[PDB]
Amino acid sequence: ALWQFRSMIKCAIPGSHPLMDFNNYGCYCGLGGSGTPVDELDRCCETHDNCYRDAKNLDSCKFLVDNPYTESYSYSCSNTEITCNSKNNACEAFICNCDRNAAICFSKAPYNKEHKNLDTKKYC
Ligand SMILES: [Ca+2]
């Protein structure tokens, strides 16, 4: 499932904590969502959830394959530098290229300390 995604975000994140802090926070972290964020660390959930939108469409391994979120792929690191298993294929490549920007961009964004299990009649 989404679980070698936690393996993923240790790799890309010098300093900041994954899911344990991250997955609760900010306004728009299902599929679609759009107000804006709150701070832009709901904005790194924006890009991985709208790349996972293009995964429900996806012609390479197509979704009668119901949810291929890790039983299929793992990844490479290590600046951040997250990618994929380095042969990188068609659909092993696509779902690891959404789950890359996920991992990287929790190191790219201004974090929610604040929206951290959120408010929003407020931020969005
Ligand atoms: Ca969303």
Swiss-Prot record:
A lipid is attached at residue 56 (N6-palmitoyl lysine). Its cofactor is Ca(2+). Binds 1 Ca(2+) ion per subunit. Disulfide bonds join 11-77, 27-124, 29-45, 44-105, 51-98, 61-91, 84-96. One of its GO terms (biological process) is intracellular signal transduction. The active site is at 48, 99. Acylation causes dimerization. It is found in: Secreted. It comes from the Eukaryota. Its main location: secreted. Regulated by bile acid salts. Up-regulated by cholate and down-regulated by taurochenodeoxycholate. GO terms for cellular component: cell surface; extracellular region. GO terms for molecular function: bile acid binding; calcium ion binding; calcium-dependent phospholipase A2 activity; phospholipase A2 activity; phospholipid binding; signaling receptor binding. Keywords: Autocatalytic cleavage, Calcium, Disulfide bond, Hydrolase, Lipid metabolism, Lipoprotein, Metal-binding, Palmitate, Phospholipid metabolism, Pyrrolidone carboxylic acid, Secreted, Signal, Zymogen. Ca(2+) binds at residues 28, 30, 32, 49. Secretory calcium-dependent phospholipase A2 that primarily targets dietary phospholipids in the intestinal tract. Hydrolyzes the ester bond of the fatty acyl group attached at sn-2 position of phospholipids (phospholipase A2 activity) with preference for phosphatidylethanolamines and phosphatidylglycerols over phosphatidylcholines. May play a role in the biosynthesis of N-acyl ethanolamines that regulate energy metabolism and inflammation in the intestinal tract. Monomer or homodimer. Loss of activity upon alkylation of His-48 with p-bromo phenacyl bromide; Ca(2+) and Ba(2+) protect against inactivation. This is Phospholipase A2, major isoenzyme. It comes from Sus scrofa. The gene is PLA2G1B. The chain holds residues 23 to 146 of 146 of the full protein.
